[PDB]
Design a protein around this ligand. Sequence first.
Ligand SMILES: O=c1ccn([C@@H]2O[C@H](COP(=O)(O)OP(=O)(O)O)[C@@H](O)[C@H]2O)c(=O)[nH]1
Ligand SMILES: [Ca+2]
Length: 351
Amino acid sequence: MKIAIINMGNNVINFKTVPSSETIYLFKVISEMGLNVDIISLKNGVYTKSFDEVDVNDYDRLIVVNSSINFFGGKPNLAILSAQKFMAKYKSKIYYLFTDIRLPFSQSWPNVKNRPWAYLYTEEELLIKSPIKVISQGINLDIAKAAHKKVDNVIEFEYFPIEQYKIHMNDFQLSKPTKKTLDVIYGGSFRSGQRESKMVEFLFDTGLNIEFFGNAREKQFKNPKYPWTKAPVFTGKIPMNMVSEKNSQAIAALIIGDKNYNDNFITLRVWETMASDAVMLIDEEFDTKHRIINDARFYVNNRAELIDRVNELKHSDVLRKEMLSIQHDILNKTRAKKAEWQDAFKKAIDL
Ligand SMILES: O=c1ccn([C@@H]2O[C@H](COP(=O)(O)OP(=O)(O)O)[C@@H](O)[C@H]2O)c(=O)[nH]1
Ligand SMILES: [Ca+2]
């Protein structure tokens, strides 16, 4: 049983980039459950083998981390093209890890054939014909199926909480008490404005000391539907393996998601935040049944409640430590189910 895992549209080298980090984390967690796996990328490296130096069909299972397939600028993006060429040569079922609703599996050919550099490729070379099984991070498979209604060879769908890999790593460790320098913090990208309403609601015009770290920038928030006056402080992006440490700088950290994530996806940030020294405050709409933590104090319905809850935490260190103890306890309860999670992953990839 030999497994190959690849990222469909981003180069993989180390933890200096997010897509690379995620692919390496998956490689590691799969390896930690006793499976033989190789990461195949553009070139050889610490964690990778090159597409040009291995036969994709020497592997019994091909796992693909979702990615965008859009082309921008000049030169052809080999990260996308070489990955799809590799996939097109595989003669068995492909397991597509669908962790981001905006990144459903799609054929690159249609987006290539009209490019000025289209002559460098052929349809037969890029057209992926193997059957594809989508492993959905969201429990709602209808949302996952709708996202792939445009691809005929995607014939199977199964839900699996992929994102829990963060808490199941052998070297996992909870963040320790940290000196606070922020009231609220949130790390992420602008996500093409797919979450602008929630970002403005909970992070803007709060009167609190809020930091928004990641690829997002103040100048991106200009939708007339969600006006604001005072924005949070935007700082640069940081390595994925430093996120919980970063969240720990704040008293509380925000949990929001895209509309289609509500009561559907449990994202990586839920675990990165739960494991941090920051109290997790969740948008009521994201988890209406309070399935993450059965304690209403961790949920906020709007800007007003977020402000109230944050001030309550600032005023009472005991309340803050009490809630942190609760979220760390619930986190450990899920970590205690690692065996079940591993077996479910194996089942998802037909092992
Ligand atoms: O500076 C940063 C900001 C974010 N992240 C990662 O990016 C994720 C957020 O992704 P996104 O903005 O797409 O939001 P999501 O949809 O995951 O909530 C976080 O959980 C981190 O894993 C990171 O590595 N560095
Ligand atoms: Ca994510």
